[PDB]
Design a protein around this ligand. Sequence first.
Ligand SMILES: C[n+]1cn([C@@H]2O[C@H](COP(=O)(O)OP(=O)(O)OP(=O)(O)OC[C@H]3O[C@@H](n4cnc5c(=O)[nH]c(N)nc54)[C@H](O)[C@@H]3O)[C@@H](O)[C@H]2O)c2nc(N)[nH]c(=O)c21
Ligand SMILES: [Zn+2]
Ligand SMILES: [Zn+2]
Ligand SMILES: [Zn+2]
Length: 458
Amino acid sequence: PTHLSVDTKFKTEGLCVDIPGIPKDMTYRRLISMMGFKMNYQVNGYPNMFITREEAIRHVRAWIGFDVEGCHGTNLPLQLGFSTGVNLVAVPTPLMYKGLPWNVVRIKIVQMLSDTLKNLSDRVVFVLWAHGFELTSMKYFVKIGPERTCCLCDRRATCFSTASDTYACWHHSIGFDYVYNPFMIDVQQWGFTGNLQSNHDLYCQVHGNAHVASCDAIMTRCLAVHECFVKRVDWTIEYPIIGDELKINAACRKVQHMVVKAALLADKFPVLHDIGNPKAIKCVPQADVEWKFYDAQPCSDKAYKIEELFYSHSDKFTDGVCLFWNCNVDRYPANSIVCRFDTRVLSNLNLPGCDGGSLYVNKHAFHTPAFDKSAFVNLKQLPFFYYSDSPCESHGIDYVPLKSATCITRCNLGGAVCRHHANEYRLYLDAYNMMISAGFSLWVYKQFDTYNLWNTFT
Ligand SMILES: C[n+]1cn([C@@H]2O[C@H](COP(=O)(O)OP(=O)(O)OP(=O)(O)OC[C@H]3O[C@@H](n4cnc5c(=O)[nH]c(N)nc54)[C@H](O)[C@@H]3O)[C@@H](O)[C@H]2O)c2nc(N)[nH]c(=O)c21
Ligand SMILES: [Zn+2]
Ligand SMILES: [Zn+2]
Ligand SMILES: [Zn+2]
């Protein structure tokens, strides 16, 4: 039950306009052969060009929307659209390219897919709203066969070159002309009513329809992300490490302990309303504050309404401070400590999402509602600072003397930062800059002032 059986039925009603007379009874085995490919009875790791809904979710980083529109069927040009926004015109002789024969179009496709996916996934999953021409055009730039490894490394092969008769992954595909062993999935097979635009526009207002192939490719992938990461959520699926996931997660927990501990020392809140992950633990377990938890799973569609979270416990969320660490609400109260992911940040962990949101894949997949500046009108941006009440003692690196107005320590209060707190300062600054560059923003109540922390050294 792992892979999609090649004898599974395939609904061809969406194909009968480009391909009139197509059989109603159709399997993937008869469809792959129809597309011009031969499986030759194979058990070499490539059982089907099409993958399941579950298998596609585990390879979401490889999703590339793909659509082909008749520009004017072997006798007419074809407009190739990809969710990267690229439009290629192939002739049988937001960016748009002029018409060119297939032998040079396939070279651009290998280059475009490789630069997109080399730091993301080991494969490519062509997300389709299939109507005919996109399946029949793959024979001009897709070659299938047994699973192979790269000729320059041990990654699996994703490209093939007719010049050298060799194979390569996304990293070493310069000069290659064919996509080797790709995967694909037809969203239209999931049982929708209506066309692509009517179904996409039910949940997203950001992607329009300029009647170009790439617009449909973007809407197709967007509709797929909504069905797999907005309407349905699966937090049990783990995703491989492809970047600084571990340092970013560790930096977020390092900053959270620093910020919440300092806010409790500076303002002496009697109560703390920790609103967010239902499995959360005290990030400052040594604090005197009364810690009250409120369960709320990460929202994947729209940001929570602060009215429905609070108003319907201590119930007096105006007492003490409220902690919204990656708990996206529409408008945070004035007595809040907030960590909110910026969906606009470009990174290999953050994928384009639905209706302004993004899909942040770090160990797990979190579809995050679109970043809204108006949510922080009652708060201010949290400035960088480093606080430490630990003993100014170095145990165990080369020391350039540290001078910083944001090093809240006894040694800095005394006019000279010690080597221990200087190491921890520069380590915390690296973690802070790691967290901010990853896309997380920090916000705090306007009364927060690091000048109140100097007095805890008395
Ligand atoms: C809720 N949320 C978080 N972020 C961010 O996304 C990343 C995923 O981290 P994560 O939540 O997968 O794990 P940690 O917090 O490191 O786990 P931890 O504190 O360790 O809690 C225990 C869990 O982690 C596991 N775990 C515990 N210790 C470790 C460890 O040392 N290493 C690893 N790899 N896992 C550990 C443990 O088995 C359990 O699954 C982080 O940057 C989050 O801030 C969000 N970002 C967006 N856009 N939207 C969200 O809704 C959102
Ligand atoms: Zn390679
Ligand atoms: Zn959309
Ligand atoms: Zn010190």
